Structures are given as C-alpha cells and as structure tokens.
Amino acid sequence: PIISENRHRAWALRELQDIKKEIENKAPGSQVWIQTLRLAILQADPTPADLEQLCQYIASPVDQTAHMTSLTAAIAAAEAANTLQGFNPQNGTLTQQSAQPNAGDLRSQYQNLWLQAWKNLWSTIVQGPAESYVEFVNRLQISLADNLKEPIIDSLSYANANKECQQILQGRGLVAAPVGQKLQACAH
Amino acid sequence: PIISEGNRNRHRAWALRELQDIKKEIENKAPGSQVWIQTLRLAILQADPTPADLEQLCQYIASPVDQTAHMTSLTAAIAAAEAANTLQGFNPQNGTLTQQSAQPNAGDLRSQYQNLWLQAWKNLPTPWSTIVQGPAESYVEFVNRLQISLADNLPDGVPKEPIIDSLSYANANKECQQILQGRGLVAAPVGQKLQACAHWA
Amino acid sequence: PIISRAWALRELQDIKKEIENKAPGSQVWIQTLRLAILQADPTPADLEQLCQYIASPVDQTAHMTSLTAAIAAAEAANTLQGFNPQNGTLTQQSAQPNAGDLRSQYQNLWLQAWKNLPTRPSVQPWSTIVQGPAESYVEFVNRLQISLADNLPDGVPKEPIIDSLSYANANKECQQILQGRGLVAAPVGQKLQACAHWA
Amino acid sequence: PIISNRHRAWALRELQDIKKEIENKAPGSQVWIQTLRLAILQADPTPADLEQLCQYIASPVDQTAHMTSLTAAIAAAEAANTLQGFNPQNGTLTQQSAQPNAGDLRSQYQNLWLQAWKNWSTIVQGPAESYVEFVNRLQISLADNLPDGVPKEPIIDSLSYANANKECQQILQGRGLVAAPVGQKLQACAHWA
Amino acid sequence: PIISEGNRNRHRAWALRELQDIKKEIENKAPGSQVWIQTLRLAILQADPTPADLEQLCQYIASPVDQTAHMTSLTAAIAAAEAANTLQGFNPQNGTLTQQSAQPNAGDLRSQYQNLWLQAWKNLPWSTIVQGPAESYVEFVNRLQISLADNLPDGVPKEPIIDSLSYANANKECQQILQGRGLVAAPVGQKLQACAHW
Amino acid sequence: PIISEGNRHRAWALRELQDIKKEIENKAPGSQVWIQTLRLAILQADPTPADLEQLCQYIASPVDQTAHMTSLTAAIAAAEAANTLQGFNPQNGTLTQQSAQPNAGDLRSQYQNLWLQAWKNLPTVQPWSTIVQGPAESYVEFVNRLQISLADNLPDGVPKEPIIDSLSYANANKECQQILQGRGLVAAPVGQKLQACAH
C-alpha cells in the first residue's frame, strides 16, 4: 500500500482477511471474483510484491502458478507490442518499474493486467433465440470491455441480435440507435 | 468519497465495511422502490462520491442484469439534460459530465450528477392508483399500500400532497367513508383522516 | 449532526438493530430513539431522514400532524421559552449551529408525538392492571408502570397517578400494610421498599 | 460523560456494549456493581447521564426504587454532613455536580449512585466441599449482602472460621488463626483432604 | 493505563473492550500458570497500568477467592522486596509503593510493582515427570518444560536444570539413544533432534 | 513492533496477536501457510528479537520454542561464518542485540528472515533436487512441488529464475520430455513451458 501525502506500508491482515471472506466462495477469474478484487486494489494502490502476496492468500498454488504464467505472458506481449504507454525497458522490467510508489501511471497498468491474468485459464458469441436482450447486452459488454466501444456497441447490439428482436429494432428502425434506446424496446 | 481538508479537498477510496453496510441495509429492498432509493440518497451525503465510486456500487449491489439496465437509462438522461439544457453550468469542453464531477473541488456538478443517478432506478423493468381498501383491510393498512405505491410510481411533475389528501378518501370502503362524512373530514389531509379511522374493525 | 455534517449509516444501522424489536410509541422505543439524538445533535432536516429508516410511511404521516399541533399548542400557551417567531418558523430557525438552546426544544415535541397514534391497541384497557392473587407487588408495579408509560392522557400529570394506583389496584394483602404503617399516600417507591419483602 | 471542562453525549455503542456484559446479572449483584463502577471511571458521567442509565439498564420498578433510596441517602449524607465541599448557595447536590469543573463533588455523587444499588450467612462448608469453594460462596454472599457503614473485612475475618466444616475449624486452632484475616486462613486450608 | 500523549504522561481509564479481550484471551487458562502469567505480562506491557488498574483486573479475571490470596501474597512480597531491598529507588516517605506508583511520571517503580504483581500468581494455592514405555518423547519433553515453567523457584536458572533432566528422566529406549550419541549434557534442543525416530 | 515517523518501538496490541493466532490457528508447525502467515506479520509490525521471542510463546508449545531457539541460534552461526550477513559488525553485540534497535533495520531484517527459516528447520518439504515427474504425474503439479520445494529449500544469493528455467525440462518424464522437445521450449521462461503441457 502506497499513501499519497506517496509512502509504502505493508498490508494490514484485517485488510486481507476481509477480502478473502468476501471472495471466499467465488470461482477464479469469474466476474464476481474479478469484481471483488478490483475494489481492494483501488483501496490500497499496491506494489507487484503486494500482488504476489495476494496470489498466495487467495489461490491454490496451482492457480497461483498458472497465474504467474498467464501474467508474464500478458507482460511480454504488452512489452513487445509497445502497447505499454510509457514503458521504457532501459530501467528494468515493468515489475521492476511498477514497484515505485510514485509510478501510479505505470502501476495502474500493471494492476490491469494482473486481473486480466485471472480472466485466463466477443464477435463469436451471439444471442440465443430466447435470451433476453438485456442479458445479451450484458455478455456483450463483458467481452468487449475486456478488449477494445460506443459505435461498436451500438452496432453489435443490433448486428448480433437474434431473429425475434431484430425484427423489433427494425420495427422502430433503431437499428442505428445507441444501445440504450435498443434496450428499452425489447424489454417486452 | 471526497474528503474536506483545506479549501482543497482530497479523494478517498471506499472502506469495504462502508460498502457492506449499505449492501446489508439495502439487501432486502426492491430495485427502484422508494426505500431502495432513499437508502442510497443518504449514503451519498456521507461520501460525496465521484462518478467512479458510484459505479463500483452497481457491481456490489445489483444483479449484473440490473447493472446494465441502470447504465442505459443513465447515459440517456445525461444527453436529455444537455439537450434540454437543464444542466446548470456545464461546459462540454472540460470533458463530459462523468469526467468533471470526479474532481474533489467540483461538488455542485457532482451534486447534480448524484441526482440523476438516483432517478435512473425508476426506469427499471424490475398499477399504482388501482389500490382500494378491502372490506377487511384496516385503514392504516390501506393507507400503507397507497403511500408506497405513489412514491414508487407517481410521476415527477406531480404533487403528492393534493392527491394523497384526495384519494385517501375517494378510494376508501363505504365503512370508512361514512365516518369522514360524519365529521366532514373528506377534505382534510389524510393524516387527520388517519387520526379518525385508526380503530375500525 | 452538528459538531463544535451528514449521517453515519452505521449510526443508522445500530439504532435499527437496537430498537427494531420495539413497539411504536412504546416507552422502550422512545428511549432507544432519545439516546441517538444526543450523540448526533440533529437538525429538522436530519429528523425527517429518521422517519423513513424506521417507520412505515403511514406512521411517517401521522407524526407530522400531531407534531405541528403540539407546536402551535406549545407556542400559543407561551410555555415555549425564548421563542421569537420573527426570525423564521421553528422548522427554519433551528438549523443554525450556534443556536443550540432552541434546537434542544424542537426535538422534544417530535418525541411526544409518538404516543397514542396509530399504535392504539385492542389490548388497550390500561389501568385495568391489578395485582393478581399470586403476582408480586414488584412486578405488579412494573406492569402498571409499563401500561402507564405507554398509555396516559398528556394533560394528566403522571406523578400523582402512580402514587395512587399503587394502592388502589393492590390486592387484599398489601393494602393493609400501607394502612398498617400509614403509607397509602406515599410515593410508590416508598410503597415498594415496605412491600418489597411480602410473599 | 466528561472528557478532559467539556461534556460529551453517550455513544450508543458504549451503551450497547455495557448492556451486553451485564445482561445476566441482578441489581446489587457485586458483578452488577463492579460492572457499573467501571464505566463511571471511563466516562465521568453527569446526574442526567446516570439517570439515563437507569432507563437503559433497569426495569422501571428498580429505577424508581433506586431514585427513592438515592435521594434519601443524599439527604442522609448532607444531613450527616459527610458531604465534603458542598455549598447549597450554588445549587443542589443534584444540580452543582453537573458542572465539568465540579469533579470532586461529581465523584461523591457517583459512589452514592453505586451505594444506592444496595436494596444470608447460612452458607457453610459441606463435609465434602473444598474449603476454597466454601470460601468463594462466602464472599459471594457477603459481597452481595452488607449493612451500610458496616465493614466486610471484620465480618469476613469472622465467618471464615465460624462457618467452616469440622476438619478445618480444628486447623485454625492449631495454628491459632481464628481471628486472622481470611487471606491468612486460606494459606493453611488450601491443602486439606 | 498510562498513555504517553504528546509528551504528556496521562492516565487513561480502561476500555471495557480492553478488559473484555484480556478475559476472552485468558478465559480458558489455569490461574498462575506460565501461560496465564505470560498472558498477563503482555497486557501489562501494552497498557502500563497503575496499582488501581491492577486490582480491578483481579476482579474481572479472578474469583473473589483468588483475588484475596493474590492481595495477600502480593503485599507480602512488597515487604520482602523492601527487606531484601531488591526494590530499587523507593522512598517510603512520599507514601507507600502502592501510592507513589500510581503517578504517571513514576515509571520505574511501577515496573517493579507490575513485576511483583505478576510473580504473585505463582505462590497461590514437579520433578516427578517421567516417560512411559510407550510415550512419545516430545510430549514427555513438553510435559516437563511446562512443569518447570510453572513450578521452578526464583533466582534459579532454568537452562542448566533443563539440560540435565531431559536425559535423567527418559526411558530406556531414549536413554540408550542419548548415551548412544553422547548427548547426555547437550542443550535440550539438541536432545530433541535424536529421539524423533523412536 | 516499530512505528515509523520521518522510528519508535511500541509493545504488542493483544488484538494484533489474536488476529495472528486465529488466522494461524489450524496450521501445522512449519507448513507453508504457517510460514506465510508469519512472513506477513513481520511486514506489518517490523518486530524486535525480543518481540519475536514473545511471539513464539503465543503460538507455539514449549517444545517447539526450544527447537526453534536451538536451530535459530545455529543458523545464525552458519550464516555469520558464511558472511552472508550483509552489513553485520560483530564488535557491537550479537545479531540479536544490534537488530533490536529501530534504526538497525537492515540487520533486523536479516534477523527476521532466519527466525522464519528456523520453523522450516523445525526438528519436529521434499528436497527440491529430488523432485521429479512420476510416470503418471500431471505437468502442472510437478512444477508446483518444484516451486514449493524451491522456496522452501533454495540457498540465498542464488537466482531462482535460471534454476526454475533449467530443471523444469530436465526433471520431466520421458513422456512429457518428447512434448517439450516437440515444441522446443527447453530454454524458455518456465511460464511458456506450462502452457504447452496443459495438453
């Protein structure tokens, strides 16, 4: 944990115990799982070290190790692809760079991947004949928010809809409307 | 949450218990029910939260379905507010509304932001005036259904005061009606209608 | 809450939990409430907030009426100490922080308003409490005092009443003692210590 | 509660906390008394605050019984003028001690408040009861039942010998401890079979 | 408790929470046992309590009987301490030890007091420990140190005693081993290592 | 426990210890969880040798304390002899002594680690070079045992990475080796090695 005043302090156990219980009965990489962790991070603004500590309190060693793996995979890809905003390899690895209290700009990015590492072990996936439009949109925004939105969402919301609701969105010709207006229609 | 310090304010993250408390508080409330909505409004006063903090709440409190549904009506009303120009003091140049209210110093706009957010819960998919007092329903019980239903349902530009006072009589059974006739409280605010009819069997 | 601010939820959480199992307008109920306020020091605004967390909307409604009634009634009677109607209504005046003395009085009527409004029971006939052939004087007084603290007309001073019913509703046995020592008119507490021992 | 010339209101939790520990004790049980004796030290509470306590903690009967016995001893104390530093000119006992600055007097009020929760000896050591167990029951009953102004210690020192079973009375003769403070009596019979 | 706050030495009253916890922790302990005494030692170090605080403790944690036995042996140790003058720095003219040590600035004496207060739990109302033909070595060892930690007399160093009895009191099987390795005089920590096998 | 302000010692809070005990309550002495549980505590408090000695007693039975004190003082001797003690000057007292000072953080830090390790060495775990993939063991588990055995048994100053990277292939069975050969990852960071044999 880093305290902007930016000084690091180690974890309080109370902090950790709370999180475990919250997540206690959730599946690894499951959205609720991901949602639970996401909050804790925001509270603390933690270092990679702190994060590795996390793998250990919450995950089976297998799952930890598996995580260690998918993590570094995601790491190199960002590093290699220069998709890392502000990454200069000259100063050490990201894990080396992100350990810095002031490096909120970089640390933030590291934090994102760490979760993403949990999402591992959208245009393919489509709405079933009787799946509710709203939940269909739910799944859609799930997978998209992962990658990357609006024009895209507003597009796929129709494009990827089933025969029934398509006929409906056509009915008012909201085919090009923002997903928000499309939702209201198929609610019935 | 934004915290008062100097003439500058500082932002603070959630405490999990803070979040848990509200969840516990709201756990058994209906989405968009007044108790649901009022529960939150007070919470807002506590933190004076930025747009981010609020969304975080959706995840903690709402079924994923409800989470999406609210966001929908939300982004919609923003535009409507801009389009109708009901937004006091907004310059799109300084970012969208979502961006500006995140600032510790930008409380008035955040104040406005907080308001719309609440209202978006009445737009959820999850008849108020059809309710009448049964032959065996206590007036207080009758009045209960009535008041819940309005605060739940009645349109916004519409004053509850004149209506409540009116329907409290109109929609009563013969039994309770004759009494109000008896003292001529047909037109009194319902609270005085209440005072009278509380003992009936 | 006014300090030398908005609500704490936990504050709200505790009170519910603490009182939840208490009756509307009941004595234990009123007390559970009376306590929270001092801890917080709330405005007319904060109080309306309270109604909603704890009370059904009907009950919310009824209170507003008897309150405003007592307000006029208290003011008209000039029992209200120091009130100058000129600086705004009572509801208006009480919001400024340095005005602690006046804010204190607003709070009181709010409490009183919970008595005998739509809690009123079919179980109601208070003062019917009598000491059973085998009920202890000490609990008997308890039951009595409970019924009274729940049910009494307002213009009626409680003090003289308590000291009285303690003799009147007592059974055959205990009345004689009070005669025996001549304690029939004594404050009940004195009636208690003397009959505290009887079987 | 008074914290460092300024008064503080109660916290619900404080009150919630206290209720919970005392939950199963009887008024005037020593445990009852010790429980309360502690909070006063923690808070330094006013007459109002105490009166509030009656209400959170006691059935209404006991509340009144107390108010009676209290104000009575108050008078009895002032009448006996055992009341140190009180000027009736500056207000009543009940009124004056409410001042944060009036600590000496507030303290005396509090004791009485304790003493007021006031309103036996048949307990004996069985032929097969351990002396220590016997001794416990004794202090339990004694710490509970006392005439005011009547010292427990000399009373204690007495029954410790008197009410023991056959075996142990004999022991105190042997060492000559019949009148000795009980702490010195325990020392000997701690070993008995 | 005495709280250092901004260079003030200020006494603070107990928190019930503070009292409740200590009880909760100690609840299932035997009176005057090492674990009991150690448990208290921690509390004392956390709070730095006055004689007043300390008596109050007897009452929450101890039966009325055990409290009295304590007050007794305590006031006794006070005298012996004065008599042996193991008591460093006390001037009786400014009040009794009980009296002076209640003062916040008086840290040295209160320490000695607390110490005596602790020791007082020993004396209130042991080498027979042996290993059965079928008893695990470790448990035997455990049993031993327990007893020593509870019943050994003061001024007497435990270590040389421990190192000795760990061999002396073992059964044939394990004795043959300590002889076998010649660990007969070794610190017990070294004796432990070998008999883990039998 | 030491408090940092731009560094004063303070004693334990009982709650602190209880937290630790309750969390650690159901673990075997020296088990990784045990070890992990401890490693964090150190981080939270930065406790002195004295404090730690206090800690043994709260969590450990009297036998385990001695076994600990024994191997501890031993590892101390082994490390000093090896001069793996970074910054240690013997003239100013033992490691147990200097590191009790708030400013002697580097050395105490060195002290704290050993204290942990001694529970590993508890005379009351598989040697990593013995860890091999059985004829029928899943790759993922082999690696796991490996990393455990390593974190448990790796010598200091020795970087794990190349080691991890090396043995991960070497110690695989004939079956999985063909697979690793098949795609050619023998020199790859281990993370890339796991991905393949999942199949």
Side-chain angles (χ1 to χ4, degrees), chain A residues 1-120 122-187, chain B residues 1-122 124-125 127-201, chain C residues 1-118 121-122 125-199, chain D, chain E, chain F:
Chain A
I2 309 293
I3 306 158
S4 68
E5 297 154 342
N6 293 334
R7 299 336 177 177
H8 183 273
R9 72 163 176 84
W11 280 107
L13 176 59
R14 189 167 70 90
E15 294 172 323
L16 305 158
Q17 291 176 314
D18 292 347
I19 301 168
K20 184 183 196 169
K21 179 188 85 182
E22 188 57 49
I23 205 166
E24 191 80 20
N25 44 331
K26 286 74 182 179
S30 65
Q31 184 196 359
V32 177
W33 173 282
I34 296 295
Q35 305 280 326
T36 309
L37 304 180
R38 186 186 283 112
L39 297 174
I41 293 170
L42 302 172
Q43 287 186 151
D45 186 19
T47 67
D50 299 323
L51 295 173
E52 185 187 349
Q53 295 175 24
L54 296 179
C55 286
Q56 301 172 3
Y57 198 88
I58 62 176
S60 63
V62 168
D63 294 336
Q64 300 177 29
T65 300
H67 189 259
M68 281 296 301
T69 292
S70 180
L71 175 61
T72 52
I75 291 174
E79 178 176 359
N82 193 34
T83 49
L84 290 180
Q85 307 175 345
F87 176 57
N88 191 345
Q90 291 168 334
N91 302 328
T93 68
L94 184 58
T95 306
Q96 296 178 266
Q97 304 176 356
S98 297
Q100 296 164 332
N102 297 330
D105 293 343
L106 293 178
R107 179 167 57 250
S108 300
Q109 297 180 34
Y110 185 98
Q111 293 162 347
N112 288 333
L113 291 174
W114 197 92
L115 286 168
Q116 293 301 310
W118 291 97
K119 285 178 177 300
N120 303 327
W122 49 267
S123 69
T124 66
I125 297 308
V126 183
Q127 181 186 21
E131 173 183 11
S132 175
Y133 183 74
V134 188
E135 195 172 11
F136 160 62
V137 175
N138 220 34
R139 294 165 62 220
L140 193 79
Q141 272 181 328
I142 287 164
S143 284
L144 265 187
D146 287 350
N147 311 78
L148 186 71
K149 179 186 312 180
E150 307 72 32
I152 309 168
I153 279 290
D154 302 345
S155 165
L156 281 171
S157 37
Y158 165 76
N160 290 23
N162 60 21
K163 185 175 181 189
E164 294 269 52
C165 296
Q166 276 182 342
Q167 294 171 321
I168 304 179
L169 299 175
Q170 296 161 354
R172 287 194 56 183
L174 295 169
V175 191
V179 58
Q181 299 183 341
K182 290 181 171 165
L183 275 162
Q184 304 172 212
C186 306
Chain B
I2 297 293
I3 304 303
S4 71
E5 172 180 11
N7 296 286
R8 291 183 183 177
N9 292 335
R10 214 74 116 103
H11 179 271
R12 179 185 63 73
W14 285 114
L16 176 58
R17 188 61 182 161
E18 291 174 323
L19 305 156
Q20 292 179 316
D21 287 346
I22 299 170
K23 184 182 195 287
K24 177 186 84 184
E25 186 55 49
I26 202 168
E27 63 190 344
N28 45 331
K29 287 74 183 178
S33 66
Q34 187 59 293
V35 45
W36 172 281
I37 291 177
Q38 298 190 325
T39 306
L40 304 182
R41 186 184 286 278
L42 179 49
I44 283 172
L45 301 174
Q46 290 195 276
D48 181 17
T50 67
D53 297 321
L54 295 174
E55 187 187 350
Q56 295 172 24
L57 297 178
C58 287
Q59 304 169 3
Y60 204 72
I61 68 174
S63 60
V65 170
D66 291 336
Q67 300 179 29
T68 303
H70 191 259
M71 197 55 200
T72 293
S73 179
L74 177 60
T75 55
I78 290 174
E82 295 190 2
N85 290 323
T86 55
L87 294 183
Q88 186 61 64
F90 179 54
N91 189 350
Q93 290 169 332
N94 302 327
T96 63
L97 182 58
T98 309
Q99 298 176 221
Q100 192 62 63
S101 298
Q103 182 177 159
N105 298 332
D108 290 342
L109 299 178
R110 180 166 57 251
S111 299
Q112 298 183 36
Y113 187 101
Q114 292 158 346
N115 287 330
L116 291 173
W117 185 92
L118 289 169
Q119 300 304 308
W121 294 96
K122 287 181 174 299
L124 297 180
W128 54 273
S129 69
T130 63
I131 48 171
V132 179
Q133 181 187 21
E137 177 184 16
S138 79
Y139 188 74
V140 182
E141 192 176 8
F142 162 63
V143 176
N144 220 35
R145 293 171 56 218
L146 194 78
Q147 274 178 327
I148 284 164
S149 195
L150 273 187
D152 197 345
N153 309 338
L154 188 75
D156 336 42
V158 188
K160 291 174 184 185
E161 313 74 79
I163 302 170
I164 277 287
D165 300 344
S166 165
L167 280 172
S168 39
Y169 168 76
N171 287 20
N173 56 20
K174 296 171 173 173
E175 312 272 51
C176 295
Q177 277 185 343
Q178 290 175 320
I179 307 179
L180 302 175
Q181 300 165 355
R183 321 240 257 91
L185 290 168
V186 186
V190 59
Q192 297 184 341
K193 291 181 170 85
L194 277 168
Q195 176 160 353
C197 309
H199 301 101
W200 176 76
Chain C
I2 300 294
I3 54 174
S4 70
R5 177 183 285 183
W7 272 111
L9 179 64
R10 187 166 66 88
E11 291 175 324
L12 303 155
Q13 293 311 273
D14 288 346
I15 303 168
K16 180 184 193 287
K17 272 55 197 50
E18 187 57 50
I19 200 170
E20 62 192 345
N21 46 332
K22 296 306 181 287
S26 64
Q27 188 56 241
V28 43
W29 172 282
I30 295 175
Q31 298 283 329
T32 308
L33 304 184
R34 181 185 264 110
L35 297 172
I37 288 171
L38 300 172
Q39 191 172 345
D41 187 18
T43 66
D46 296 325
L47 293 173
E48 298 188 353
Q49 296 171 23
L50 295 179
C51 287
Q52 305 172 359
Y53 191 91
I54 59 174
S56 63
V58 174
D59 298 339
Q60 301 176 29
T61 304
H63 193 256
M64 281 295 301
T65 296
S66 69
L67 173 61
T68 303
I71 294 173
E75 178 178 359
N78 196 340
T79 57
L80 174 59
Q81 187 176 354
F83 176 50
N84 242 265
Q86 290 167 333
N87 299 326
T89 68
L90 182 56
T91 304
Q92 296 176 266
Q93 302 174 355
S94 299
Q96 187 171 348
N98 296 331
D101 186 4
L102 297 177
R103 179 164 56 252
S104 300
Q105 295 184 85
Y106 184 112
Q107 294 156 345
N108 291 333
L109 290 174
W110 191 91
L111 289 169
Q112 295 297 309
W114 295 101
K115 62 176 184 61
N116 305 327
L117 289 180
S122 64
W126 60 279
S127 72
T128 60
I129 300 190
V130 182
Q131 182 184 21
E135 177 183 13
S136 174
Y137 186 76
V138 187
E139 192 175 12
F140 160 63
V141 176
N142 220 35
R143 291 170 52 218
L144 190 79
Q145 274 180 329
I146 284 164
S147 190
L148 271 187
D150 289 351
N151 314 340
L152 187 75
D154 345 330
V156 192
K158 295 173 184 185
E159 312 75 32
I161 306 168
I162 272 289
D163 295 344
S164 311
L165 278 171
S166 326
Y167 175 78
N169 287 23
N171 54 21
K172 305 167 174 173
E173 315 274 51
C174 296
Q175 279 185 343
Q176 291 173 29
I177 307 179
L178 300 175
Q179 300 163 354
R181 293 191 61 180
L183 293 169
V184 188
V188 58
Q190 299 181 18
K191 291 181 171 86
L192 274 166
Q193 181 157 355
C195 305
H197 306 292
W198 176 74
Chain D
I2 299 292
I3 55 172
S4 164
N5 293 335
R6 295 167 179 177
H7 188 274
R8 175 187 284 182
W10 283 112
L12 174 58
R13 185 63 183 162
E14 291 174 323
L15 302 158
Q16 288 175 292
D17 289 346
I18 302 168
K19 179 185 192 171
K20 183 70 169 253
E21 190 56 48
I22 202 167
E23 62 191 347
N24 246 240
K25 289 303 182 177
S29 65
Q30 186 58 40
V31 177
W32 181 283
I33 292 295
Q34 298 188 327
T35 311
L36 304 184
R37 186 185 284 276
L38 178 54
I40 283 173
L41 301 172
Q42 190 173 345
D44 186 18
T46 63
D49 298 326
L50 294 173
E51 188 185 350
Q52 295 171 22
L53 294 178
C54 290
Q55 303 170 332
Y56 195 159
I57 70 174
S59 63
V61 170
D62 294 339
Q63 299 177 27
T64 299
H66 187 256
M67 279 299 302
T68 295
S69 179
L70 174 61
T71 53
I74 289 174
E78 182 176 359
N81 199 339
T82 53
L83 171 62
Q84 310 176 10
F86 177 54
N87 189 350
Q89 289 167 333
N90 302 327
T92 71
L93 180 58
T94 305
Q95 296 178 298
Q96 187 60 64
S97 62
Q99 185 175 171
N101 304 331
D104 186 5
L105 298 179
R106 179 163 55 251
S107 299
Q108 296 183 312
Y109 188 90
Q110 294 160 347
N111 282 331
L112 295 175
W113 197 90
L114 286 170
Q115 301 303 308
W117 293 98
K118 60 176 186 62
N119 286 12
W120 68 276
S121 72
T122 67
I123 38 171
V124 179
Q125 180 185 20
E129 176 185 14
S130 175
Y131 185 75
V132 184
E133 302 162 349
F134 160 64
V135 181
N136 220 36
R137 291 170 53 217
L138 193 79
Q139 271 180 327
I140 287 163
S141 190
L142 268 188
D144 288 351
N145 311 271
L146 185 72
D148 303 334
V150 182
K152 180 185 178 177
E153 311 71 13
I155 298 170
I156 278 289
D157 299 346
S158 314
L159 281 69
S160 38
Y161 167 78
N163 283 21
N165 59 19
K166 178 181 177 191
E167 323 277 51
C168 296
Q169 276 186 343
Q170 294 172 199
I171 306 180
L172 299 176
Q173 299 164 355
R175 222 160 116 68
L177 293 167
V178 185
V182 61
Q184 299 184 341
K185 290 181 170 85
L186 275 168
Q187 175 163 354
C189 308
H191 306 102
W192 177 71
Chain E
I2 301 293
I3 308 301
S4 297
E5 173 178 11
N7 291 289
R8 292 180 185 174
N9 291 334
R10 290 299 178 175
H11 180 274
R12 176 184 62 73
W14 280 108
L16 175 59
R17 188 67 181 164
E18 293 176 325
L19 301 157
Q20 292 173 314
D21 291 346
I22 303 169
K23 181 185 195 286
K24 276 169 192 182
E25 186 57 49
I26 202 168
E27 190 155 26
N28 300 334
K29 289 301 185 52
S33 65
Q34 180 56 242
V35 281
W36 173 279
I37 287 178
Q38 190 62 253
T39 307
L40 300 181
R41 187 181 287 277
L42 294 172
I44 281 172
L45 298 172
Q46 188 175 345
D48 188 19
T50 70
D53 298 322
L54 295 174
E55 186 222 349
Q56 298 174 25
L57 296 178
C58 286
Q59 305 173 6
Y60 201 177
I61 68 174
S63 60
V65 168
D66 291 337
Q67 302 178 30
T68 302
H70 187 257
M71 280 196 289
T72 298
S73 71
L74 175 61
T75 53
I78 290 174
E82 292 191 359
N85 198 339
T86 52
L87 173 63
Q88 185 176 353
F90 178 55
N91 187 348
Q93 289 167 332
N94 302 326
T96 68
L97 182 57
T98 308
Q99 298 176 306
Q100 306 176 358
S101 62
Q103 293 169 332
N105 293 329
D108 293 340
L109 297 177
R110 177 163 54 251
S111 299
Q112 299 184 36
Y113 183 90
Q114 294 164 349
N115 289 333
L116 291 175
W117 198 94
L118 291 171
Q119 296 300 308
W121 297 100
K122 287 179 172 179
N123 300 323
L124 295 183
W126 55 256
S127 85
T128 324
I129 313 189
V130 181
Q131 182 184 20
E135 175 185 13
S136 175
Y137 185 79
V138 187
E139 192 176 11
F140 160 67
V141 174
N142 222 2
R143 290 169 52 217
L144 190 76
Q145 271 180 327
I146 290 164
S147 190
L148 271 187
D150 289 352
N151 312 271
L152 213 277
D154 306 336
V156 185
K158 181 181 180 175
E159 292 70 31
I161 300 170
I162 276 289
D163 296 341
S164 165
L165 277 66
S166 38
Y167 169 76
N169 290 24
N171 59 20
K172 299 172 171 176
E173 308 271 53
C174 295
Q175 277 184 342
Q176 290 169 319
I177 302 179
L178 301 176
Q179 298 164 353
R181 244 109 105 76
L183 292 169
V184 188
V188 55
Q190 298 183 230
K191 291 182 172 86
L192 280 166
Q193 307 172 3
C195 306
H197 309 125
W198 180 73
Chain F
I2 301 202
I3 306 302
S4 164
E5 173 178 11
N7 292 335
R8 301 261 180 177
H9 181 273
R10 73 160 179 82
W12 284 110
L14 178 57
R15 187 64 181 162
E16 293 173 323
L17 302 159
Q18 293 176 317
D19 290 345
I20 304 168
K21 187 183 196 288
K22 176 65 177 157
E23 186 57 49
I24 206 167
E25 194 82 21
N26 297 336
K27 286 73 186 177
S31 65
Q32 184 53 38
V33 179
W34 176 286
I35 295 296
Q36 185 57 50
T37 309
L38 302 181
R39 185 111 90 276
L40 293 174
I42 284 171
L43 300 172
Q44 188 173 343
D46 186 18
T48 65
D51 296 324
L52 293 173
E53 190 185 351
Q54 293 172 22
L55 193 44
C56 285
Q57 301 173 50
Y58 198 85
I59 60 174
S61 63
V63 173
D64 293 337
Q65 300 176 29
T66 301
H68 184 258
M69 280 296 300
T70 298
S71 72
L72 173 60
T73 51
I76 297 172
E80 180 176 358
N83 293 325
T84 54
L85 290 182
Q86 189 172 354
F88 177 52
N89 189 347
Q91 289 166 331
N92 301 327
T94 68
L95 182 58
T96 75
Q97 297 176 225
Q98 305 177 357
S99 61
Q101 184 177 7
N103 297 331
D106 187 3
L107 299 177
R108 178 170 56 250
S109 298
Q110 294 183 34
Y111 184 97
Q112 293 163 348
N113 289 286
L114 293 174
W115 195 93
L116 290 169
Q117 294 298 311
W119 295 100
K120 286 180 170 105
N121 300 328
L122 202 64
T124 307
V125 288
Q126 294 187 341
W128 55 270
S129 69
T130 66
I131 307 301
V132 184
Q133 179 186 19
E137 177 182 14
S138 84
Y139 188 76
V140 189
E141 298 159 346
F142 162 65
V143 178
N144 222 220
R145 291 172 53 216
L146 194 80
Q147 274 182 329
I148 288 163
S149 285
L150 271 189
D152 212 347
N153 315 339
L154 227 259
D156 303 335
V158 186
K160 294 173 184 185
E161 308 74 32
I163 304 169
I164 276 287
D165 299 343
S166 166
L167 279 69
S168 37
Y169 169 76
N171 290 26
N173 60 21
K174 186 176 180 190
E175 308 270 52
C176 294
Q177 278 183 343
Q178 291 171 12
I179 309 312
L180 298 173
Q181 297 160 354
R183 291 187 57 184
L185 293 169
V186 185
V190 57
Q192 298 183 51
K193 294 180 173 165
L194 275 167
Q195 306 170 348
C197 306
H199 306 102

